[PDB]
Amino acid sequence: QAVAQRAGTIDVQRNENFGKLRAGYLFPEIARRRKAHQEKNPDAKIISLGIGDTTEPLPKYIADAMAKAAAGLATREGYSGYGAEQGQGALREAVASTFYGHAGRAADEIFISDGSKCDIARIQMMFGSKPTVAVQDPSYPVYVDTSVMMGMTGDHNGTGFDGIEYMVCNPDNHFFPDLSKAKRTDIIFFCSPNNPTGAAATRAQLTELVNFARKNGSILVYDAAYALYISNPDCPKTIYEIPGADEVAIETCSFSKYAGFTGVRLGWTVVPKALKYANGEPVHADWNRVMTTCFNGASNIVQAGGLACLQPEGLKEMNAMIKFYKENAQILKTTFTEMGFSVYGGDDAPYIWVGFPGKPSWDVFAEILERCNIVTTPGSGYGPAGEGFVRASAFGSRENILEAVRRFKEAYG
Amino acid sequence: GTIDVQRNENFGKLRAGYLFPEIARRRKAHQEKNPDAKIISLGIGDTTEPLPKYIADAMAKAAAGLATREGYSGYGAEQGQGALREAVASTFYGHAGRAADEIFISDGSKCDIARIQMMFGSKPTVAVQDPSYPVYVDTSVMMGMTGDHNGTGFDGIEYMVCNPDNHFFPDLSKAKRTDIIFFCSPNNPTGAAATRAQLTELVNFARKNGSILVYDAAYALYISNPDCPKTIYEIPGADEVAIETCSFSKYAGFTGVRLGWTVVPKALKYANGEPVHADWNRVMTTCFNGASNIVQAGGLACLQPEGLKEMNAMIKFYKENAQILKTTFTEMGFSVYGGDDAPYIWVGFPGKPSWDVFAEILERCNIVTTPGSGYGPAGEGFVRASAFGSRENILEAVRRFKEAYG
């Protein structure tokens, strides 16, 4: 019949929350802008210091663990077990003892997933639309964008979204917000080291943050994805090194490509049993319900790679890879500082954060791409307080980092 | 206490934990009471047979190769590798109109259903086939799309009841209109594969009502009957109303694999014209980090000629297991459904609660099954038995069932 030759029919309205979003997500838009630039300039040899997708080859001890788990699928049955789609016990024990020995977290509070971004979306589903949110500003834009999608916010106001408390971190406050003036919210999202500024909060700063959350009765979602890169002994690698954090904080961590590991999609969350909603219900029970209902369990291939990373040879190879990326960050930082720019980060994180005052950061991004054929990311893509800066990733080969430096000195030196 | 955030009200609407973890817990408790019992699971379906080696090979080579390549960078795409999207579009939708840019590769269908529910939000009304795998009801409840539980099901859900007397297809002339309709074919747990005429009626009903149809084709690889479409897009006009979810994960029979896809046609538009594909792409790029390239290499190998030959042999094996189970029960006088187009059977145990039949089978036969009431209100009165297991264990389960019930 004619019906099948015709459009249309559908009476469901678009979710109002998606209409609030202003632009597509930052990293896909940067990849699209890079592709458009290569279409305009087919001969350009583009170096990406943008999204961070050009991670170096994975440590062989980890790759080999994953390969052997994959090949082993041909000679075993499917696994069966109550303990658990929460993640293999051996991996959750290795994560608990490697990262949370001093910090007191148990294996049964660790939940292994396929990535931190996926877990942030699932946390937001767990919170639902009612809670109010505060976000460190600038920050990786998953926190704001998932808050908007879940309906936790008002409309965009031309600078940020109404209803989000942006906790501004900048050079003048040493990248830590003024909590004596910060508004109370239900949820606080905080990252250390922060992406994009590279700032790793000090022990005294995190003690302030935990005491702020506790006084306000807020849940703190703490992103420690880049904590492997912290060098300063005064900057904790987990929020659980702070007394009282177990009653307010959920931590998210990543061993994925985002954190520097080629080919990996793996993270975890920590939800302490001590963390309880206002009427006493444990957050851990609801998180477990989300993880068993909305998720299918991280693959046993990737969990084999995570467990290998935590064995002696895996830690040795991982540490060498972290040291290589940090040396790339220092090469980029020194290049910019010798040219007279103000540069932040690169000491505790594998990227740097460069001031370009007086021009919108999206225009700077376009100018660097035009003049140097280098992709960076614009600071305004990380929220209102990101305007005036650009981030450059250290995830790349040493030859590409060195060619980028040559190109930057030629254009800007 | 020191936290003032209230629990999400929608989590208080859930009455019990999720079905599959509870079956696993029951199995473990039974084993602890009976440490010498040799328990055969025909329950969750976790005991899938070893993965076809051509797939495992591709995954191992992709993993090993991580040690000698840089991270991938590319516009085409955080939706999944182009070669795999093209292979899915050609293999599964070559006569059904779908393009590679309508395919979104993920790490599994249950994660996609939760992300779909996020995209829809709390305002839409939901109809769910009943019985069905409980992710559709439970995610609807978590997202705030429903009222409270009422003793049988949740208020605010239109249950579309499929049973033996209606040939496992609801009476659409009497079904209330909703915004979203979740339907699966073959259905888990009944095994029913909707016919071409039935799916034409479903697509017509969705189009007349202006509803979005979310169609789960996870088990369509197991369909034998040529009258039963393997994708909703075989029905003219389905591109204007339907999203399809599919799985190549352990759920669909593939040991070790966490891989699925969704189809969101470019044609599918909300009431005021906005494309659903654009919001789904926003979700998949914001709320997800892209399926591993190890598992996508497995997916691509499964669709090459040797992969398909080995996958087809695996499907044929599980279907033989399902026929062995089905024959056993029918010879004992039970009414049995499924097994012909799905790798599980659905057996009538009228007059006793299915959770009591679950307990009885586990105590008398040391066999795990799943109770039909775990799949919604119209699942009561039945038990599902999975065909995902070794031939030795299937044969031993049949021996035990004959001793107990024959």
Residue numbers in the entry:
A (entry chain B): 26 to 438
B (entry chain A): 33 to 438
How do the authors describe this structure?
The DAP/lys pathway can be divided into three parts. three steps that bypassed by the reaction catalyzed by DapL. as a pyridoxal phosphate (PLP)-dependent transferase-like fold by SCOP. enzyme, the algal enzyme is specific for L,L-DAP.
Cr-DapL is a dimer in solution. demonstrating that the enzyme DapL is dimeric in solution. The predicted mass of the dimer is 97.66 kDa. two monomers in the asymmetric unit. V-shaped monomer and comprises residues from both monomers in the dimer. residues that are contributed from the opposing monomer in the dimer. Numbering is based on the Cr-DapL structure. substrate recognition, fills the space that would be taken by the PLP cofactor. active site does not easily fit the cyclic THDPA species. strain expressing the algal enzyme is able to grow on DAP-free media.
